Design a protein around this ligand. Structure first.
Ligand SMILES: C[C@]12CC[C@H]3[C@@H]([C@H](C/C=C\C[C@@H]4CC5=CC(=O)CC[C@]5(C)[C@H]5CC[C@]6(C)[C@@H](O)CC[C@H]6[C@H]45)CC4=CC(=O)CC[C@@]43C)[C@@H]1CC[C@@H]2O
Ligand SMILES: C[C@]12CC[C@H]3[C@@H]([C@H](C/C=C\C[C@@H]4CC5=CC(=O)CC[C@]5(C)[C@H]5CC[C@]6(C)[C@@H](O)CC[C@H]6[C@H]45)CC4=CC(=O)CC[C@@]43C)[C@@H]1CC[C@@H]2O
Ligand code: HEM
Ligand code: HEM
Lengths: 453, 453
């Protein structure tokens, strides 16, 4: 019973209940609990996720030492997570010399050279979504964004794997779309109060990934493994290293699964938050629709170079990620006893960075609740501390697919705004009350109208 | 998660926390939590010991139906308790047709005829304690009551087994006194919030009775089993039925162990509460010392008949048990769906009777906090509801050794008050603040002076 660790180091925090800790404070979500703890205890505080002590830091120098400086030596892995089954070899779940091995073997797959060659591949499903998006513009019915974007994000992330060319929104039955789309609840709440039951669930072969499909995705990838014109994509640029070194056949499959759990919901959710802001702020939607027509006249198809050229588009993507950081938190496990930026961090304490709260702190942001894309203009690019705004993390273990996610979301935003306009509807929850659950989602699916240009 | 069972039946109670329930309210002990719930919700209320719902009843008709009337059909066993190892065959822990079997096979061992023949046996250790009690009367030092009474209660309960004749207070080293005297804490608090971990502890052969001595007490009883003048005692009157019917060799050993865990601390603790009241109320000690000298002149040795003759002695024993009911609670497990005295009791709910709170309810008792032995005079014997004052329980599953415990405690009180007087000391906690733990004990051991007559 080590619930007195934060009163021992003189670090303030809410009163933890026995065994439970401060998990009852999650009744308002992580975000509201992070904002209240920030406006109460200040720069550094602590709490307990059961018996797990979590130290929160908000100083830019302290965040840099944890994320960048002493990352390899001290803060290398995130908090343990189980049960995983055979999926502990995933890079986002791997630890130590297995992770840095996997990090290097998968780093060249996210190179701008490899990314410029993926432009014609993922540009073939933007017009696919436009065809499916025109279906509901003439119907006159409001459109759920997570369903149209989810199909596009699926057809993009699958074509970058090997890949497969499906029309997910028009084909909701092939044995590869529904098989995949199975991607603070009664289960995850118990494994935090009872982390000692995790080794039990592993010997029972129970996993958070239902292994009714993973073994399919094993021998469907083993079928698509080996059994001209084979070009840039994830599985190919991972199979070249298949023939510290080499990637097991099962390890490479785990990295293919983690990329789908990586790109699918994260791309579609952020795209949903972007179209909500463009609807609730039609002035931003018009100024963006004019920079697209300027860089790309005549509804020209976008290229790799023309996307980096649009600056007001990157300002819209960055300002939406500030209001809706889908990561919410950034966590690192303290390996040994260190003293960073003044204070001493004991061994085994999870260091957490409240990304959602810092993105709405009035000390760094003017009108925090407002959606002001001008916050990221070249006139204002420098008034932003890089260690306060981290929607993709920072340091050696940041988002490995940041350049892919930004290019994939922007390419969809361009060809969608080239043909469609967005004016809010009645069912539109305004202001959008965020999901009080355990992941940054809309409480009710973002349902908006869709019109044609 | 069935924490909404009491709001479902319209039964009031404190708000239960998830998984924990109302166990945090035990921070003031069971008694203070029972008194507060009685003066708040009234006749019937409920709470949760983790996921276990507990319905408390206080109506005399409702208590009679649970304890007496529908006892065999519905309320037969107490709440499950583990881990026990081989000790689940104990009568206090046995259930159903195994208990009623064990209840009948052990009932004749507590017969008044068998009890009158135990008078000369246990009267040989009263003078043993007087010899050891005189040692500290001349020393001039205060005496801890639980140590002198504990040795007497040990020398009595062991001589009634087979038995063994030791001088426990003067011989604290023989391989039978210290071997036995091993008789809301970090362990029991966890098995109430985690009752699902009890089957785990059983397959590991872990037991609440440390089996470093139980197997000794197995083959030390197996040694004393079979390997003229053999007369009335527990093991002999249980070995006659050894040669539904018959008592396994291991079952009979379990009943011998449960009797030591039955008589030892219960007899010594109540005897400690009695001498505290006689000290804090010297007027009661004088009137009792005069009835003993009247029934037993010349310091005559007590007999079976002369103990039942002393009425003011039984009034002192009964009034002390009211202020200090060592059982505190009486619990029964509901077997099926029944509707007793109006309300419907669902299957699986533990029915609890707050014995401590009812013994201090001003609705039945005048000056509840006062020690008034005249409450049990023949002039006042009838103003007491028999289902409100139950220090030995009531019904088919009440205290099987009530007649033995009353006779054993009174015989000690007689020959002690015949030779010694008691005047309180400085270290004497006045008023005696009861132990806030998980069993009715003194917070600090009752340390009083001892003088000779
Ligand atoms: C950006 C990212 C999604 C968000 C992830 C981030 C990466 C994930 C960390 C552990 C993986 C665990 C298994 C997993 C695999 C997947 O691939 C789908 C999502 C899940 C199920 C995770 C979902 C959140 C869980 C349940 C946490 O509560 C503890 C355990 C986490 C799950 C680091 C992380 C740490 C945080 O603390 C906030 C959320 C983020 C930022 C993902 C890497 C690519 C993916 O796009
Ligand atoms: C009067 C009695 C002592 C008091 C007992 C009563 C009889 C015991 C019930 C279950 C036995 C469990 C194993 C046990 C064996 C022993 O023999 C020593 C004490 C222990 C360790 C018990 C101690 C209290 C425990 C830990 C409870 O918290 C749940 C589990 C109980 C233990 C019924 C009971 C029910 C109550 O709810 C209040 C207390 C009482 C009245 C005893 C029968 C003889 C003995 O003299
Ligand atoms: C809007 C889209 C995305 C956002 C906002 C995002 C953000 C993040 C963040 C905040 C982290 C954690 C950084 C840290 O802990 O310091 C992360 C890690 C990671 N991301 Fe993303 N991501 C996105 C899309 C993607 C995509 C498209 C992929 C893969 C195709 C991907 C794969 C990963 C992986 C594998 C990790 C873990 C890397 C490691 O642990 O070494 N993410 N991402
Ligand atoms: C001051 C002394 C004692 C008191 C106040 C006392 C009180 C009690 C109480 C209240 C119960 C539970 C009744 C119920 O649940 O309805 C009980 C049960 C029991 N007592 Fe005692 N007791 C005492 C001494 C003894 C002694 C000396 C023995 C044995 C030698 C003993 C053996 C038992 C057993 C075996 C049970 C359980 C019976 C069953 O479950 O069927 N007790 N007692």
């Amino acid at each position: 019973h080590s619930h007195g660790l934060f009163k021992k180091l003189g670090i303030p925090g809410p009163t933890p209940l026995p065994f439970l800790g401060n998990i009852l404070s999650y009744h308002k979500g992580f975000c509201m609990f992070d904002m209240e703890c920030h406006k109460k205890y200040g720069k550094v505080w602590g709490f307990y996720d059961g018996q797990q002590p979590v130290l929160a830091i908000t100083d830019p120098d302290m965040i840099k030492t944890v994320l960048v400086k002493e990352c390899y030596s001290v803060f290398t892995n995130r908090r343990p997570f189980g049960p995983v089954g055979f999926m502990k070899s995933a890079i986002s779940i791997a630890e130590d010399e297995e992770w840095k091995r996997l990090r290097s073997l998968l780093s060249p797959t996210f190179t701008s050279g490899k990314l410029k060659e993926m432009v014609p591949i993922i540009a073939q499903y933007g017009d696919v979504l436009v065809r499916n998006l025109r279906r509901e513009a003439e119907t006159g019915k409001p459109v759920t964004l997570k369903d149209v974007f989810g199909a596009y994000s699926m057809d993009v992330i699958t074509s970058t794997s090997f890949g497969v060319n499906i029309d997910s929104l028009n084909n909701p039955q092939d044995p590869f779309v529904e098989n995949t789309k199975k991607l603070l609840d009664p289960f995850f709440l118990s494994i935090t109060v009872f982390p000692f039951l995790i080794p039990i669930l592993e010997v029972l072969n129970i996993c958070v990934f239902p292994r009714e499909v993973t073994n399919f995705l094993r021998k469907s990838v083993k079928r698509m493994k080996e059994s001209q014109k084979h070009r840039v994509d994830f599985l190919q640029l991972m199979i070249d290293s298949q023939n510290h070194k080499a990637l097991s056949d099962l390890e490479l499959v785990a990295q293919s699964i983690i990329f789908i759990f990586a790109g699918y919901e994260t791309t579609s959710s952020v795209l949903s938050f972007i179209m909500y802001e463009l609807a609730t702020h039609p002035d931003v939607q018009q100024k963006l629709q004019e920079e697209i027509d300027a860089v790309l006249p005549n509804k020209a198809p976008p290229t790799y170079d023309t996307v980096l050229q649009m600056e007001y588009l990157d300002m819209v993507v960055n300002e939406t990620l500030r209001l809706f950081p889908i990561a919410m938190r950034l966590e690192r496990v303290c390996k040994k006893d260190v003293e960073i930026n003044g204070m001493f961090i004991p061994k085994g304490v999870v260091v957490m960075i409240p990304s959602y709260a810092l993105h709405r702190d009035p000390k760094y942001w003017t009108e925090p609740e407002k959606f002001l894309p001008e916050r990221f203009s070249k006139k204002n690019k420098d008034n932003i501390d890089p260690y306060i705004y981290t929607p993709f993390g920072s340091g050696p273990r940041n988002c490995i697919g940041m350049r892919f996610a930004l290019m994939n979301m922007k390419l969809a935003l361009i060809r969608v705004l080239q043909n469609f306009s967005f004016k809010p509807c009645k069912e539109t929850q305004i202001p959008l009350k965020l999901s009080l659950g355990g992941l940054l989602q809309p409480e009710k699916p973002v349902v908006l109208k869709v019109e044609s240009r």
